[PDB]
Design a protein around this ligand. Structure first.
Ligand SMILES: NC(=O)c1ccc[n+]([C@@H]2O[C@H](COP(=O)([O-])OP(=O)(O)OC[C@H]3O[C@@H](n4cnc5c(N)ncnc54)[C@H](O)[C@@H]3O)[C@@H](O)[C@H]2O)c1
Ligand SMILES: NC(=O)c1ccc[n+]([C@@H]2O[C@H](COP(=O)([O-])OP(=O)(O)OC[C@H]3O[C@@H](n4cnc5c(N)ncnc54)[C@H](O)[C@@H]3O)[C@@H](O)[C@H]2O)c1
Ligand SMILES: NC(=O)c1ccc[n+]([C@@H]2O[C@H](COP(=O)([O-])OP(=O)(O)OC[C@H]3O[C@@H](n4cnc5c(N)ncnc54)[C@H](O)[C@@H]3O)[C@@H](O)[C@H]2O)c1
Ligand SMILES: [Cl-]
Lengths: 333, 352, 350, 346
């Protein structure tokens, strides 16, 4: 049994030791330390040799690893500075699959055109609207950002519609997001690195946002394009079924959390699971449900020892990356 | 010491406006009158005041919706759908269909009190599956490994036995075979709303929200229809002969155009997630909704769209500045049945 | 290949399920096609699930307390504090936070105390003050988003979406100072030892207003315990004003009340000292027999406020045989409806 | 297109661009945490809280006008800024105890308000340890084994039995000193005594007593100490704890302060008591909240700092920061960036 004792600053300011001793601190600090162990286990197994097919069918030529890591995050996380932390993960090819919402895709792309700014939660809606300043928490995203996005996007959508009509090509969210990653051609973009490293980005509700607004506007031109979500479901589910092992790292809740968990039901559950969300169990929401709820469904395995950290991900994810993904890249070099 | 302290704590205060509401709860010495009790939630404060404000907002929507208005009295989708003076968008999450609030939503749809529904895959499937088999009251603290061994799925303190889903598969596969045939032969493009209309027609059960939505030409939009048991069925089904394509772009055109062509719009959002953003985003197209009630447990501090206040939506133009949006911070199972008692149900009773 | 993918997946997703017990409750909400019947609607909260089910379980627990409380029992039918207090078969401890008294809930608590349906109260300094201050002047409905600097310049104090004008406190000072002069005199001349409960009994007698919880608590010999009574306006007045408030005597009084009880029920609206103090008193008798918690706190931060009732069972503050119930909700939304289905129904039945 | 493509005003030239820390630059924790300011949401609040506490600490070291001594404790010395630190009992049950102890040990805070549990668990940890358990452990099973649960932490019941053995003799002396010397006990006086008696450099209460930092607890009877006080009163009547004298001490400390700063971990009486003391001097100058409380229920616990401004408990010119978080996650890191950096600098 582990004795409760925090870090003693009489020993000096050692961040690595401080965060190790989160294990003996208790409450969510202990969950932080358990989450570091779970992710380091995923990253370790992922570098091991394994039996069978070393290729995955989607995308074409995607290599398989001992452990398939599914990374899920909400749109607000991309809107915040956590985007740089997620980009680092995808850039260094440390995750195999992404699930995010329309917001998670567009804000990442829009940031390559124009920045977002620190505001406050208590700014008045009518005053902000008069000035075309959109509020996401304490973050300002000027509406000119979206105007620039429209200018950038329509020519790409014209090409996509042409490829649909001429080549009988069936667009899915993941195929479209792969394309927008290739087009943005920016080493600061998560979507760019996902395209480069053949990490598919699935977004069943991709119409729910600016990309939606543009697709809607684009349709008047010549009828528009079609986005099939059934094919994309085949892709994510098959990836899980064909995996040697799976880990899930879910930041936030909503569709992203359920989709990744559902895909892992197809293989009778994930082997490793970290949740980093602020949701609560009392309302009966999937968002606030505990990892042990997912075990009842068979979406997380019984031998797995899932960890959930109840915290804002902007506070804890950058520190998780410091202790896991970043340490792993530093060790390899 | 005492003189400095008195200056800070003894400060004189301005006169309050003459219209100001006095805080006074319901006095049970007057007897048990539920209508009076819930009216006096207005002078109770905190969320109780928000409950009373929400009753007023929904009753305003329902009142305006009965009125005459100028212009086109038809909406393009579904075909031949009549337009009212206010278009009411009802949004709910999957767990609210897994709860008994399903019966409250069904009553609204059956009585043609709302014009448009947005819900998730769960919100559709659970409603259909409840016509085949029941869900049961369990507890939140039931062990996952033990429940899994027994094929008992847990959703909060509710048990959905996995045989319910096996039955769903038996029921759904033949319908998907017909849908695929209609896609191949008639060059028909399926969307979530078109598929949910079809499943409503097939279930043919007066206990189903989806049945009444079909019957009353109330479209159900679900952009992420593949996220659930329906997706699982869709997955398995694709191996039989290739499968069905579900286009989300056409369904976006339908909901956005419904908003753009509305005389007025009200939004009633139970929960957060895609449902909330999708309805709010459709109303951006007309420069915001005229009336808005949120009933969710989300918090602002994490910056999530889910936990955001209605005034955030005003900044984007998804809710009008004129609008006086109300959020109740509560579990919908506690407050929504009582909202229906004071709003929708009162309206049907008054009419009949 | 394709065939193996779909057949592996079907095995995981199509698992057969065990039979549910025959007494299992089917999830079914209230059907408004049956008409608007609030009593039936709230009964069927039991089969609605999530917190609605907890509401229905809480109604049953409180109705059990009120039922047992009317029964005959064995032994001493008197409690030592206050002097000449009648013991019932169940002692009900009511706890509530200051904000609840700030809200319209106060009228619901006053009704309970007025009709002598609870035996003991624990609240904070605010819970005592606001109730007294509402006899002198009213509180108004404002909004959560009102600016602090603007409100301060106007002497308007904000408590959630409720406004308490600072003149209310000035009036309180005028009213309280003469009472504190008398109390101090009684301390000096009669060697009297003041406790929070003794002082709150006195302020109840002085306010002499049938709208006041504290007035009815005094009248019905329902003790009000407030260990941190210095934490507020009463504190401010005691600061400006030579009286000693002993909290050790008051602790003996609440603990002995628990130890000498035939049965105990706890009804806790909120969290904080109120919750910990009532739960601690019941540890002395190896736990309460019935317990309803109505609060918004969460477990994850390890707070006493957010702890679930099962955690208390670990301490022995709540009994193993008890079936405690917690509703995760704002009390202003649920407490008046609990009173409609429990305390009010009970008074109507008699 | 008219509604969705509306043109936007230019942002001020000083506006902060949202950019998180790039791990391509390597693992630098000081740079990472500086970059929380541009990160957004709570991360931004973390960075603003570091600035507020560093302002308090920096100001505290400077010279100021007037009396340089405080009345309570008698030998207490006043500083340019008086820092009031508040914490709930669960943070003392956690390893954050070691972080609080470091603050008090290095005389970096002047006043302390906590609950009975915040005092008890600090002393009991010098007698026997607490262990890491889980939130989901069954109450009946734990009770059968005499294991008390606080969140995911186990406090074996023998810990409290040892406490009782340690505390009763001390209480006997306190009662003797009340009867013979006509001494009036307050919570702060009793907690000072317990700190002296524990005589253990791991204890917050030990360092508080040694550095003349007072610990106020208006509801010091609410817990194991109260239980001991209850049993002990049956011998010869027991001790008397006056809360009015202790109110005079904390209020006067604030009223005589050149400047005041508040650091509140959690809510409850601790938060209101410190805020109320500062109301006497027309509010605190600097304020950091770390709690998980929400505004919606109207509780004082979940109230934003701007509510406290309406009452005059926090000043208008102050720029209060709340971090919405479990303090076990953020407080150790706040100490790394503020209090520890300060001790390292001097
Ligand atoms: N405003 C925007 O940024 C924006 C932009 C365009 C589209 N959208 C759309 O809005 C919809 C709703 O967003 P969503 O579904 O991605 O998420 P959401 O807002 O529904 O959040 C899901 C849940 O995740 C948790 N969570 C969120 N942020 C967290 C954080 N920082 N730390 C910890 N937990 C956190 C919360 O419990 C929350 O309820 C999406 O469909 C998206 O496409 C949003
Ligand atoms: N657990 C299930 O019931 C279940 C089963 C099948 C499908 N799904 C899928 O899970 C995904 C995510 O679920 P979702 O988006 O429908 O909801 P969700 O669980 O993500 O809830 C989103 C937010 O709604 C609010 N909320 C939830 N329940 C509430 C209540 N009772 N009262 C008030 N507010 C409440 C909360 O703020 C919560 O963060 C969906 O794509 C859905 O199809 C879930
Ligand atoms: N701002 C005020 O209203 C005010 C005024 C004067 C005195 N005070 C003092 O503030 C201190 C703190 O207040 P407290 O200890 O009474 O409670 P609190 O404000 O600390 O509330 C504690 C917990 O109770 C729960 N809760 C509160 N209100 C609720 C509600 N309406 N519904 C459901 N759950 C609810 C929440 O989980 C909260 O975290 C006390 O010492 C009190 O005397 C407050
Ligand atoms: Cl095509």
């Amino acid at each position: 049994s582990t004795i409760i004792k925090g870090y003693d600053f009489n020993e000096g300011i050692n961040y690595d030791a401080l965060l190790d001793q989160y294990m003996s601190t208790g409450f969510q600090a202990s969950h932080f330390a358990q989450a570091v162990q779970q992710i380091n286990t995923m990253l370790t197994i992922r570098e091991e040799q394994f039996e069978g097919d070393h290729t995955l069918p989607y995308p074409e030529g995607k290599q398989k690893r001992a452990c398939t890591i599914f990374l899920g995050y909400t749109s607000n996380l991309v809107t915040s500075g956590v985007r740089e932390n997620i980009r680092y993960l995808v850039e260094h090819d440390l995750v195999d699959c992404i699930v995010t919402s329309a917001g998670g895709v567009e804000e990442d792309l829009i940031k390559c055109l124009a920045p977002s700014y620190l505001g406050a939660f208590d700014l008045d809606g009518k005053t902000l609207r008069h000035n075309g300043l959109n509020r996401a928490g304490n973050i300002i995203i000027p509406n000119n950002n979206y105007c620039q996005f429209e200018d950038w996007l329509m020519p790409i959508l014209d090409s996509c519609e042409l490829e649909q009509k001429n080549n009988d090509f069936s667009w899915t969210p993941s195929k479209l997001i792969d394309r927008l990653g290739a087009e943005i051609n920016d080493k600061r973009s998560i979507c760019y690195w996902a395209h480069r490293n053949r990490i598919p980005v699935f977004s069943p509700a991709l119409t729910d946002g600016s990309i939606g607004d543009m697709l809607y506007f684009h349709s008047f031109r010549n009828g528009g394009i079609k986005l099939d979500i059934v094919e994309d479901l085949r892709h994510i589910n098959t990836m899980a079924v064909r995996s040697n092992r799976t880990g899930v790292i879910l930041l936030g809740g909503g569709v992203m959390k359920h989709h990744i968990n559902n895909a892992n039901l197809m293989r009778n559950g994930s082997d490793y699971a970290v949740y980093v969300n602020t949701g609560q169990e009392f309302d009966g929401s999937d968002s606030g449900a505990r990892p042990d709820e997912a075990v009842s469904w068979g979406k997380v395995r019984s031998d797995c020892r899932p960890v959930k950290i109840y915290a804002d991900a902007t506070l804890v994810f950058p520190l998780l990356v410091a202790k896991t993904f970043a340490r792993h890249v530093q060790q390899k070099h």
